[PDB]
């Protein structure tokens, strides 16, 4: 059982430094995996800057002033992965974490009624006792009584105001879809095709807007909406389009002349 983590062996999507400190926090197990998560203390301290020190993050959280999933937390360490709404009511602000283009955690700011919306990808379906069907998700949530049309790897729109599931969205056909992991993170596009290799990983080919096709694993597909004009949730800072190295450098210079 591991209870310690070193800064280098920790993700640098948390944007820790080589120098200053030796350890990084190992979060308590929860909805999300160690690599894909970002621990509370990291967010509050290094990004939002409502804390300058570890101890100050305990001060805020133990007390309680912070909610995720609309539930208040007294937890110092807790995962925050993907499609999680966090709300600090003291500020009155609602963040929705996502994957920004270029592999960065996005923190995107939402209207208040969008922060009751959430999207969870389904992993398995199975029948449990009493013939009661269950969809188990990638956040470990159990949706009792899902629709009879549910399949593995589809999204379920999930009301956090009161817990239930309205209409689903499938991974079928061309639909607006975004990537999770694999270093095509936050890049958005239509499904062009879904290749099958049975007994092995199923490739899928995505085509983003303004062309430039590419390939990513089925496992890394996470649906957004029916269409780009039917999206239920906001996009991060960049729209889900990447640009060439040359153009990055060019634009960096142009703005620096101001």
């Amino acid at each position: 059982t591991k209870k310690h983590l070193k800064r280098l062996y920790a993700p640098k999507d948390w944007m820790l430094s080589k120098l200053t400190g030796v350890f990084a926090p190992r979060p308590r197990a929860g909805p999300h995996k160690l690599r894909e998560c970002m621990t509370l203390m990291i967010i509050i301290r290094n990004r939002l800057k409502y804390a300058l020190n570890a101890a100050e993050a305990q001060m805020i959280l133990r007390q309680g002033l912070v909610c995720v999933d609309g539930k208040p937390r007294k937890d110092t360490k807790y995962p925050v992965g993907f499609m999680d709404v966090v709300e600090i009511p003291r500020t009155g602000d609602r963040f929705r974490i996502l994957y920004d283009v270029k592999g960065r955690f996005a923190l995107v700011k939402v209207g208040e009624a969008e922060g009751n919306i959430k999207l969870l990808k389904v992993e398995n379906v199975y029948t449990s006792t009493g013939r009661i069907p269950v969809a188990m998700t990638h956040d470990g949530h159990r949706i009792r009584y899902p629709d009879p049309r549910t399949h593995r790897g589809d999204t379920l729109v999930y009301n956090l105001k009161e817990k239930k599931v309205v209409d689903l969205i499938k991974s079928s056909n061309g639909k607006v879809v975004m990537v999770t992991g694999g270093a095509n993170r936050g890049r958005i596009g239509e499904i062009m095709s879904i290749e099958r290799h049975p007994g092995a990983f199923d490739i899928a080919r995505l085509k983003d807007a303004a062309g430039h096709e590419f390939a990513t694993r089925a496992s890394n597909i996470f649906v957004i909406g029916k269409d780009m004009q039917s999206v239920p949730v906001t996009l991060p800072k960049q729209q889900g389009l990447r640009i060439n190295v040359i153009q990055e450098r060019e634009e960096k210079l142009i703005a620096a002349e101001a």
Binding site: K49, Y50, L52, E56, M59, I60, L65, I88, R90, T91
Partner: protein
Amino acid sequence: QKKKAEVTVRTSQFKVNKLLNRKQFIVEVNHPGWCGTVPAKLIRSRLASLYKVADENQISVFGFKTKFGGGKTTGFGLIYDDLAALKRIEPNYRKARLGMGKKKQPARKSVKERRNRNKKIRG
């Protein structure tokens, strides 16, 4: 003599932190013609007039970084709302520069030695 030295204090990026009820403001200093480093007393006075605080008690500042060549300094400071909020929320050392800190705990070593001997006793 040929001049009067003055201490100029400014600020750059400001926060309102309602969670801890404090302000977080990156200070700048300039201090043209001032001899040596600027004592923190002056800075507290300038900041008082600037943010319309009636106290240098609520103003508590830590760290100052003197850039190479000439009189220059930059730093960071904290204003709090109430004086009760200050005492409670803030670290011991920061407070004790104002003289609002707590008395130091007895030496670490003597604690250890005694804390061991307490494991032996039954009452």
